[PDB]
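Changelog entry

Holo records now carry the ligand SMILES as an explicit input line rather than a separate metadata file. Below, a converted record for zinc ion, shown in the new format.
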Amino acid sequence: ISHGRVFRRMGLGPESRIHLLRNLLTGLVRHERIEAPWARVDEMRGYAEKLIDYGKLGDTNERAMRMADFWLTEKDLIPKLFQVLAPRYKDQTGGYTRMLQIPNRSLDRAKMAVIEYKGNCLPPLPLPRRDSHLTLLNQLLQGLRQDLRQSQ
Amino acid sequence: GKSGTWWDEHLSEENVPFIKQLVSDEDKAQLASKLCPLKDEPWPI
Amino acid sequence: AAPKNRRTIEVNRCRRRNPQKLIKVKNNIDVCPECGHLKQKHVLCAYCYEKVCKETAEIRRQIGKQEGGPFKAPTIETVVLYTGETPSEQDQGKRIIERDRKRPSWFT
Amino acid sequence: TARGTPSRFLASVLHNGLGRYVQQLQRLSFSVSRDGASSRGAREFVEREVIDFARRNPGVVIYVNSRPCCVPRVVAEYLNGAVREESIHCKSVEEISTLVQKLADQSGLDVIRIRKPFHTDNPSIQGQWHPFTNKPTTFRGLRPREVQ
Amino acid sequence: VKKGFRAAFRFQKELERQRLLRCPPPPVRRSEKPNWDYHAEIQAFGHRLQENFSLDLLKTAFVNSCYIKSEEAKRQQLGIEKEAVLLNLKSNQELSEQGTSFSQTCLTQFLEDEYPDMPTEGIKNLVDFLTGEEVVCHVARNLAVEQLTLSEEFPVPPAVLQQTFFAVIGALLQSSGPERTALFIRDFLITQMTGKELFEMWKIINPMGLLVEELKKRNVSAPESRLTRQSGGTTALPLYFVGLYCDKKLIAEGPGETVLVAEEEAARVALRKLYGFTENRRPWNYSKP
Amino acid sequence: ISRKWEKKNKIVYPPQLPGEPRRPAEIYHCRRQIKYSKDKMWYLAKLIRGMSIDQALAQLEFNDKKGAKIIKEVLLEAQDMAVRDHNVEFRSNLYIAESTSGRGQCLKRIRYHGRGRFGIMEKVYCHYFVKLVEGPPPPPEPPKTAVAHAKEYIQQLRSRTIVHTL
Amino acid sequence: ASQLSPTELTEMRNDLFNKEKARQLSLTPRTEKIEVKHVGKTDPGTVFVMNKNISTPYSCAMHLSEWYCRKSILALVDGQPWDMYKPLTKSCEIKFLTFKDCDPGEVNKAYWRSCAMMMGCVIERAFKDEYMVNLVRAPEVPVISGAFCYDVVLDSKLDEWMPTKENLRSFTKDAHALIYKDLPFETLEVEAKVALEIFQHSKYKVDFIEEKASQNPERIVKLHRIGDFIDVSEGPLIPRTSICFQYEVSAVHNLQPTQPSLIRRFQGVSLPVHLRAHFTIWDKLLERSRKMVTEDQ
Amino acid sequence: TEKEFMQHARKAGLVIPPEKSDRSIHLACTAGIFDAYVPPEGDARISSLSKEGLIERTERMKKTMASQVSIRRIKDYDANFKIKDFPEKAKDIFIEAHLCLNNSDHDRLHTLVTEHCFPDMTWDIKYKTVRWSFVESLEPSHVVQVRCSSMMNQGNVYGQITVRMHTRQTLAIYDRFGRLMYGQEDVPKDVLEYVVFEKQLTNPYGSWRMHTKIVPPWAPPKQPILKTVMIPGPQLKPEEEYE
Ligand SMILES: [Mg+2]
Ligand SMILES: [Zn+2]
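Structure line, unchanged by the conversion:
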């Protein structure tokens, strides 16, 4: 029975799971693009949201500094996270880290996904664009909207 | 053959919120219309 | 445990040819507006995915060739370019990484 | 058994007993070897009784191929088209005579299961029985539990 | 290896039998087989019918014009001139027509002297069914005369078979006396009508119309239908019995699932009773005067 | 070893007459020695069965198995040989008529249990058969409604007659 | 123009159309090979070798895959709208379109024209034989409008009745039954002379043919056939008729201060099978299409 | 539990006769033609008997002298040989070769034609049926060039004789299923071709066998195909298409 409980187990326990999530977070901060199973990328995004929030809260704070030093095992990523990814989202709150699903892997056929931050100097992934506002259904909806607006 | 479909499939980026607001106003008006059942045609008590 | 007799071929057929074990026919396969290499709903196309992966790999190769050794991570943003294209005025403090091919039509 | 072999019905080929009776057997192709110890009965038959068998019924043609073989056989064709080929390997003259007589007396029907030995074309004479038989009719055919 | 030859021969024969059974070859006519003799078969066919046929008439009737055309085409496409036997074959057309006319008039005379209550259309349809292609083809196939008929096409179309049947009938008429051929065609045609229903060979459309016409020809007013018995009117398997009453008198009765088919069956029974062709009629006397 | 499936593409037919139908084409192709199981190949064949070639390719491209790509390549090369040699112009006017699986040559190895005993490791091999026929795919057999059952029951109740007498 | 039964007129119409199609297909000697190029986007640089006045763009799409035949409504030939069932002539380039495209306008116009023609065909056979009926024209209404209209002239004895919901339900059932059977939209570039000679009955059709042929010096109209019904429309249409998944006619409006006699104007809404919606949007579009809409000026 | 798979072979014919051996190969033909004949441009316009002579008739006289000296050589090597009845011999050889190809004959077609044109006439037709037949010949055949080589590789010489031919043929190529594909039924079409015959002179017997056929570049196009041919583009790999 696991009602209302998340925390998907991966490694041999909580410590190994946290270590793997920290490694994934460091890789996502460095390369800004990582393909991994859906649960791993979901947990990575969930932790990266709070990481970006804490980095945006401030720099001189000792709590955020200790958290960045703990969750980043490369040291050099801390100044980058504090001076690039923090001033970038100064106008956004919690709207970032877009998740996209890929098919399968050519090894064991496992469900994977790729996530990335907004902006991104790398070329954007092919987003599932919706239908244009010129199809029959869209034109009928626009006509009905204009009719109800002129009738009001 | 026929594939799976839903309601927000063939809609643009400026039609989904419009349809949501329209159906919300519609259900709110339908709920508000059935507020005074005694003044209509009630059955004998 | 040990069987007392032997299952027949009829029981084997009824067990292995049931619709529960047979593979279901999915109806989520469509086409793609770009390129078109048989994609699926809620799943990105493999062709454009491979293209953007190769492009990201080339950009990372160029970055590693420009950075040199490990343990760097610059404190400024980055911007990639292609053949020609002079840097704009709002891209002075960003690192310039130019390539050696024309600019694609899917990257603006 | 009957559940493993096909069956048929007992009927005439073209109603022989009604109008006139015709000979069902047509040709009799015999294969008697020239030298050997397995066709002595057939040789003696063709020597002594084949003329009498041909003169008994003019509607049966007898063919003697006289092919040097080892197993003497006989081909019997009928009007319906059935071809029954049997072997007279090491048989006496009386046995072969009885066999050819039985072949000439029979027709081209199969020797499978008879299935109902009696067969009639007009089974109903005084009206075929129906569930309404031996039941008197009421006034105006009024059904029970009615008012009119 | 296993030493032997007889078991191997039997196994090879079994393999050949299975091969010829799985892949049936096209059947060949009896004339092209080795064990075959035309004159012997003609004599056997002439002696098995308990009659007195002639060789010339049988050889003239057992051929066809298509056979002569094929023979002349084959002799002209190769170069061999055979005008000493081909020009004296004599087609079997006038003899076939004479035999057809004789069979038709004999059948009509028999149906008139046996069933006096048969109308013109009835006897016409009866003599057309008795002279139909199916019955004559069945008789010719059961008489083993298809193998003796000299014509093209191994299965033999029904037209050529009916033509050669009428030709041999005319030949028998020209050879022996008229009474012999009359008894022959009687015993070989009327025996097929045993056990068959009347309207199965007539196939009418509206039995009620012909019934009321025959009644008006018999100084009768008009028949009316009444429901005699019934069982189940609301179920999927209904049964009804409609009885035709003429001047408060029952004449016939016909069952059926509904009322329309029941009335149709009653009209058919009444029309068959008015013509005298019922199941309790006198059977045909197959004897000699 | 017997090979009679790859030789069916050489059966030459006589020239037809103008009063004869078009007659669809028959393309036979199969591979030998495939490292796979016969049960999974038969499952894939049952998944395919009588459908369009494009639909079969689409279903096999997203099928997470080992033999999916093998069957995809088989269908691709069969369609190529059909449009290049078997005189086929339309690439989407094909459908699989027959699709089954067989069994390949097997070897023997060891298993090594937890004592002096052991097992017989038999290298399971299989094949894959498929036939391509031109023209549109035939529609599936629709299920019979109550009218068909009623008519069949009426016919059965009407066909029964008197038995064990005359 | 004379007294004709409601059968022999369509008999002569369809046999004359068949004779015209036979003459058109026999006008060419042998089979001339053309080189049509594919300048689309999915598979660029593809050239096809087809026949002249025999090959159709549907057969060309069949050479690709089944998707190009299931998702295809109108073809682009040198910037001109071309349906999927029409023989080609000279060698040029072709481009396929769909509903879920960048600018779906020509496909929508063709779908609306096809739906109007189908409504006219299903309504011209749902009246009494004693009451003569006439078909005016099919005005090209924009996609922003509520529903397409089709003016139909009835008899002078029926100028005071209003069809209830039962007639609308019967018309929708007949439209669904007509959609159930697969009947292509066979078209042909028929000469205007023989086009007007085939009719010679309804003056409205003759006037429409004259107005549509007076715009081009070649005097060539665009005739279509749905199994056994001939109508005059503008531009190409849709290939198959099974594309319409939801078909339902709204109401009817009668205009009077424009002509002494009383004319009818029926409306209706339709949605393809590729762009099907839910029941809520369906009833919304059904209720919104019942209003009066006109775009003749 | 220790068995593998055998049967290790390849499906490719490599070189193995001349690898350390003392037995060569005695061929009966050569690779291609010696010299390509160039028909006149106005051949279709001047398809009658004769016309006016053109300017500078030295080249045609030199070609005639070369043909005459080649005929003299082949007569000195092997006497008793005519030239006037040679076109008729070539015509009947071509006719019987086409007939045996129509009747699906190989043991005779191998000796009727050479070892060069046999694959070109048996490859893309092995799984197909033909209904070829000769109806009538129009313009009589004539010889246009007589040449011979002197290759001293194995002491074998050949004499290719280019003899033009103009007649009417009836081609009917069906399919392996029985349906029509290429030509029509009985259609007396008009087409001309230049056929060359090669005979192994050094052979102790020697038979005039058809070498090959040369088609001029100004020849009219052939009849179109009854089906539709699809020409797809190259495989677009994950990159970019510039065309
Ligand atoms: Mg685990
Ligand atoms: Zn794509």
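Spot-checked after migration. The first strand of chain G starts at residue 33 and ends at 38. The CA atoms of residues 210 and 294 of chain G lie 23 Å apart.
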